[PDB]
């Protein structure tokens, strides 16, 4: 399938003679691979995947150095934002950034991303064409005007099209199969008697990876996406994930109902009925 790299950056300002906390997290194929936190003992970029040991100290020098600069950038930006929004000293404020790469399975660039959020709301984003900006708020306009003035998009476009892609290419061969992992789900349904002639059928999927998955309940080929319950997919803590989905039906007629589970690492969907 396709591949991706992202860096998720955050700066959080809190009231004081304090400095904002700057946190930067790297991801290759959605899996955290490097990380830098400004509240660290010894502020630096640490590996988070074993295959990143391969990189020598020179890499870590550059990247953490690169981090300290971003840290400044966020600090200044954070102050400007306070102006732009007419917010008065003593606030808790947050500034976020996602940027990176998508590759198809030909390792050919598919799309670059660059977007910012203030207070957890879209603030400005590079458009797919990688030369125009979308700005949400009125306050974002002045950034846009300014960045259109300085031709910022050309700076990012160079990065998104060049380095981001190459380094991802580099990480991909060092990560290799490691991040090709799938663990398929295991599924069962638990049978829960209700009042009123009912039973709650709960369809479980456990120990799967990646997190993406879909579970559905079917009455007679028809798909009851209709008043079933889901939970947000959850981490087990061990690298795998879990989810469940329930329907309420008349017990005795449990063969009528069927759960299906869809996941990359399945040769094909799982079909399962409650087993007496």
């Amino acid at each position: 399938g396709p591949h991706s790299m992202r860096y998720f950056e955050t700066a959080v300002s809190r009231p004081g003679l304090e400095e904002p906390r700057y946190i930067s997290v790297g991801y290759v194929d959605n899996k955290e691979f490097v990380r830098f936190d400004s509240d660290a003992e010894n502020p630096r970029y640490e590996p988070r995947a074993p295959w990143m040991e391969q990189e020598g100290p020179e890499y870590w020098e550059r990247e953490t150095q690169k981090a300290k600069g971003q840290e400044q950038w966020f600090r200044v930006s954070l102050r400007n934002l306070l102006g732009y929004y007419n917010q008065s000293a003593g606030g808790s404020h947050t500034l976020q950034q996602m940027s990176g790469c998508d590759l198809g399975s030909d390792w050919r660039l598919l799309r670059g991303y660059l977007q910012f959020a203030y207070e957890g709301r879209d603030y400005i984003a590079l458009n797919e064409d990688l030369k125009t900006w979308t700005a949400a708020d009125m306050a974002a306009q002045i950034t846009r005007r300014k960045w259109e003035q300085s031709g910022a998009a050309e700076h990012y476009k160079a990065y998104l099209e060049g380095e981001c892609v190459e380094w991802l290419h580099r990480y991909l061969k060092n990560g290799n199969a490691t991040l090709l992992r799938t663990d398929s789900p295991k599924a069962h349904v638990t049978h829960h008697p209700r009042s009123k002639g009912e039973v709650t059928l709960r369809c479980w999927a456990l120990g799967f990876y990646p997190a993406d998955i879909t579970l559905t309940w079917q009455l007679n080929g028809e798909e009851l996406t209709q008043d079933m319950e889901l939970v947000e997919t959850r981490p087990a803590g061990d690298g795998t994930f879990q989810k469940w989905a329930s329907v309420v039906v008349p017990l005795g007629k449990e063969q009528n109902y069927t759960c299906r589970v869809y996941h990359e690492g399945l040769p094909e969907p799982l079909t399962l009925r409650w087993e007496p």
Binding site: Y7, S24, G26, R62, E63, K66, A67, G69, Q70, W73, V76, S77, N80, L81, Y84, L95, Q97, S99, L114, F116, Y123, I124, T143, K146, W147, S150, A152, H155, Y156, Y159, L160, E163, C164, W167
Partner: peptide, 9 residues
Amino acid sequence: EGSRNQDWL
């Protein structure tokens, strides 16, 4: 590898 932002916001 991380990017270097250009002009501030």
